[PDB]
């Protein structure tokens, strides 16, 4: 069983996002007090705050790390319709490197791309637009270019890249919505990049999901030949995507997939808020409105069963 340890954050408002770094030794927390804090652990195991600087003018929703090969880089999305890219410079000073302001509505989420694709960033706003920025020169973070923009016809709430590093899978991004209109429309759409046309195109759509979606997450591939996706809603859903063999006609359209749902859990008896995978993509952690965290794993017969329940305090 796990052992709990409380941390005194001293945030003047709600803590919205917590994210670990690449090496699992540093943590970043962004809150609604327009503040971001960085925590480092010591030999004793205690966590100490090492930086606390005001970043934006409105609430800060999401903050994420970049791969260490490019340096200590953070990206944050705010309610003031902006995204910011910060860097650490040597004491430890965090300096704003770039600001992206192309959005006209609240920026809902921001996430980095997998390393093998370069230094790319993806931001989804509340108006239903997902933009992809790229830095051609990794040594100059002050300049960025807008590569692609996609319209989803519905307000966006979360995005996720496909972390597969194989050369047989084109880059994929999944976008979820949190609309509550009475019309039972689709909520999860998956786009794929086409090398020939150099454009992202709609590839798949999950018609069985009609409730508002609060979070989605791909699972780390790490050698598999298909994809696993996890969706958080009034319940927890897990889907598997197996690409089909490409026809000899060599069609230039998006790759076709076979979609199956392999697990649907509703043990939280409430709105499930967050989902997250472990490092190896074998254990799923879900946190809902009950105030408890649940862990899920699958046996060798592909049956997903709960393995642990954790309670605060």
């Amino acid at each position: 069983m796990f052992v709990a340890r409380s941390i005194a954050a001293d945030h003047k408002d709600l803590i919205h996002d917590v994210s670990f770094d690449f090496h699992g030794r540093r943590m970043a927390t962004c809150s609604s007090d327009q503040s971001v804090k960085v925590w480092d652990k010591s030999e004793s195991g205690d966590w100490h705050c090492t930086a606390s600087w005001k970043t934006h003018s409105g609430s800060v929703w999401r903050v994420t790390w970049a791969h260490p090969e490019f340096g200590q880089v953070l990206a944050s999305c705010s309610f003031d319709r902006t995204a910011a890219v910060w860097e650490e410079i040597v004491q430890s000073h965090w300096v704003k490197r770039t600001t992206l302001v192309d959005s006209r509505t609240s920026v809902t989420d921001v996430k980095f791309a997998p390393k093998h694709m370069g230094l790319m960033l993806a931001t989804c706003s509340a108006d239903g637009i997902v933009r992809i920025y790229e830095a051609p020169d990794v040594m100059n973070l002050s300049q960025w270019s807008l590569q692609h923009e996609i319209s989803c016809k519905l307000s966006c709430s979360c995005i996720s890249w496909n972390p597969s590093s194989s050369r047989a899978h084109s880059p994929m991004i999944a976008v979820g919505s949190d609309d509550s209109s009475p019309n039972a429309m689709a909520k999860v759409q998956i786009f794929e990049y086409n090398e020939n046309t150099r454009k992202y195109a709609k590839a798949e759509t999950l018609m069985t999901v009609t409730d508002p979606v609060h979070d989605i997450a791909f699972a780390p591939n790490l050698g598999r030949s298909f994809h696993i996706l996890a969706i958080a809603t009034k319940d927890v859903r897990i889907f598997t995507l197996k690409p089909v063999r490409k026809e000899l006609t060599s069609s230039g359209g998006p790759t076709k997939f076979e979609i199956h749902i392999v697990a649907q859990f509703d043990n939280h008896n409430s709105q499930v808020w967050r989902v997250s995978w472990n490092i190896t993509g074998t254990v799923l952690a879900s946190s809902g409105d009950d105030g408890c965290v649940r862990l899920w794993k699958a046996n060798y017969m592909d049956n997903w069963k709960c393995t642990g329940i954790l309670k605060g305090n």
Binding site: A4, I7, K12, G24, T29, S32
Partner: protein, 578 residues
């Protein structure tokens, strides 16, 4: 109380100012080219009479601020852009209800205000840097207050006091004045960094004044003491244009911005970080906001530059706090789980705080231990298989040890066909790679070598190699990562290590580059690689400092710097500061 529903109407010209009567039945709207009064019914509003009478345009017609007298229901005042103030009397039977004109100002009159009780006193602040008082008794009404500052933006009477008013200036200063002593001001203080655009007294409190400027912050000031004290500060997303206390609520204020943003906000000062309510009806920049009835907190009125004026109901506003995500969750490389949740879900308002916890396991040490002691080359196949099997059995992974032993039996030898077991080996590799155990598959692939290399396509091999290398780098095991890269069977992975790892060195005496296989300068004929400590020629490893351009043998320099903090060449540079 007043009854109705949210309802919008379209004007013919952009609107710059709106005002309300005492009966909450008619609202006057004025702008650059619009001047009309409207009666709002339970279904919609309808114009009653426009003040744009006469086809001849006038500079006095371009009004920027209009106020409805709170004492008489037939008195209106307008401040034109030509530096003039016009009075309008609805009681006059003439179509042109203009009554009196005062051209005292020379610059644009920014704000005009009435007196709550006196129906014959008006105040005007203009761009001239002066403030003018006017008596409607048609007597000698000239009374000029010189603030000795930038242009005046807002001027307002107090509600409790009869003679006291306040003024804001574009320099960022607020002056409290009295009408009985025009000789000098009573209070003066810098409220904001930059110009201040709006101010308002608290409808119930007797010493609270709220101010707002371009600094995107609205702060409440207390005036009871000799020195004004700041109580609450709220940050918006744009330059704050106008602020109005909500009636019947002691800690609620509505705010409208001036640029960039179009939405109207309702804030509670006790929670200064998220808006209490939001209105997003308008599409252009909001210009005028006003509470309908001084004792009805239910309805609001707002006119914008899109020639649209709308009445909003508080219950119809959007609540961001009701739909905010209240939890954060993340995993760590060592099996740690970080979880931050709202205080209410775990156990003025207890919903404004959160608790952060980390859960730890008493998690994947077998991975590190296996990666550190496996053997991959330098010995015959049987020895490698036996060593790996023993190592696996040490950690309790019996099946892996059995797999290693069976591999040794299969390969390290009236016989079976020469390639009887190829399919089984390929399927075993796939099986071990399909469950995230890339380590075993990569180790087997490296050990077997060419005996199985041709049965697996290159893409899958590259995928496995990259995944294993990424995991090793995550756990910060550089030796094993480089060992895997060196012994890789894939061309790309083998070439991954040779990208820009060659250094160019030149002698500092002749400034010429040196060859790649010698230690003597071609032109200087000097041993350019003499260790600074032992004064011998260095053939192999050389450590160099970027500061003083000195160095030498790796171990010599390391040991020397363990004992002192000076460049051993005697240059004075502290190469490892402190």
């Amino acid at each position: 109380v007043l009854t109705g529903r949210t309802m919008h109407c379209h004007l013919d010209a952009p609107a710059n100012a709106i005002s309300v009567c005492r009966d909450a039945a008619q609202v006057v709207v004025a702008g650059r080219s619009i001047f009309k009064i409207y009666a709002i019914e339970e279904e919609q509003f309808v114009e009653k009479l426009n003040l744009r009478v006469g086809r001849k345009p006038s500079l006095n017609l371009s009004c920027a601020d209009v106020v409805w007298h709170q004492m008489d229901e037939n008195l209106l005042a307008t401040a034109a852009t030509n530096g003039v103030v016009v009075t309008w009397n609805l009681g006059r039977p003439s179509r042109n209800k203009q009554d009196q004109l005062f051209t005292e100002h020379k610059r644009t009159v920014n704000k005009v205000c009435f007196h709550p009780t006196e129906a014959h006193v008006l105040l005007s602040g203009s761009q001239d840097g002066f403030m003018k008082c006017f008596d409607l008794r048609r007597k000698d009404s000239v009374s000029t207050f010189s603030g000795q500052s930038e242009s005046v933006r807002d001027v307002q009477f107090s509600i409790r006091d009869y003679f006291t008013f306040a003024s804001t200036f574009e320099n960022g200063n607020v002056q409290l004045w009295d009408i009985r002593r025009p000789d000098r001001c009573e209070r003066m203080f810098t409220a904001h960094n930059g110009p201040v655009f709006c101010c308002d007294w608290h409808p119930e409190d007797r010493g609270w004044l709220a101010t707002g400027g371009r600094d995107k912050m609205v702060k409440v000031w207390d005036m009871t003491t000799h020195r004004a004290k700041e109580m609450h500060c709220v940050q918006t997303i744009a330059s704050v244009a106008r602020v109005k206390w909500r009636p019947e609520c002691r800690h609620h204020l509505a705010t409208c911005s001036m640029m960039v943003d179009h939405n109207i906000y309702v804030w509670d000062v006790r929670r200064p970080f998220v808006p209490a309510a939001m209105f997003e009806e308008h599409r252009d920049v909001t210009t005028g906001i006003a509470w309908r009835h001084p004792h009805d907190p239910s309805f609001l009125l707002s006119g914008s530059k899109d020639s649209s004026l709308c009445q909003h109901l508080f219950r119809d506003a959007s609540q961001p706090v009701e739909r905010a995500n209240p939890e954060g969750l993340c995993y760590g490389l060592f099996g740690d789980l970080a979880f931050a949740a709202k205080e209410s879900l775990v156990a003025f308002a207890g919903l404004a705080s959160s608790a952060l916890s980390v859960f730890e396991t008493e998690g994947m040490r077998w991975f590190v231990d296996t990666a550190e002691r496996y053997a991959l080359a330098g010995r015959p196949l049987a020895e490698l298989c036996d060593h790996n099997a023993k190592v696996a059995r040490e950690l309790g992974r019996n099946q892996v040890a059995q797999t290693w032993t069976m591999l040794r039996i299969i390969y390290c030898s009236s016989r079976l066909p020469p390639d009887f077991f190829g399919v089984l080996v390929r399927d075993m590799l796939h099986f071990y790679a399909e469950q995230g155990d890339v380590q075993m598959a990569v180790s087997v692939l490296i050990v077997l070598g060419e005996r199985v290399r041709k049965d697996i396509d290159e893409q899958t091999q590259e995928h496995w190699y990259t995944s294993y290398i990424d995991l090793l780098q995550r756990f910060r095991l550089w030796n094993v990562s480089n060992e895997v890269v060196k012994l890789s069977t894939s061309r790309a992975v083998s070439c991954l290590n040779q990208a820009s790892t060659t250094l160019h060195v030149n002698c500092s005496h002749c400034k010429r580059p040196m060859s790649s296989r010698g230690w003597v300068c071609d032109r200087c004929h000097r041993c350019a690689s003499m260790c600074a400590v032992c004064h011998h020629v260095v053939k192999g490893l050389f450590v160099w400092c970027q500061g003083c351009s000195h160095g030498g043998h790796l171990q010599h320099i390391m040991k020397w710097l363990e004992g002192s903090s000076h460049c051993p060449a005697g240059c004075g540079h502290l190469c490892e500061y402190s």
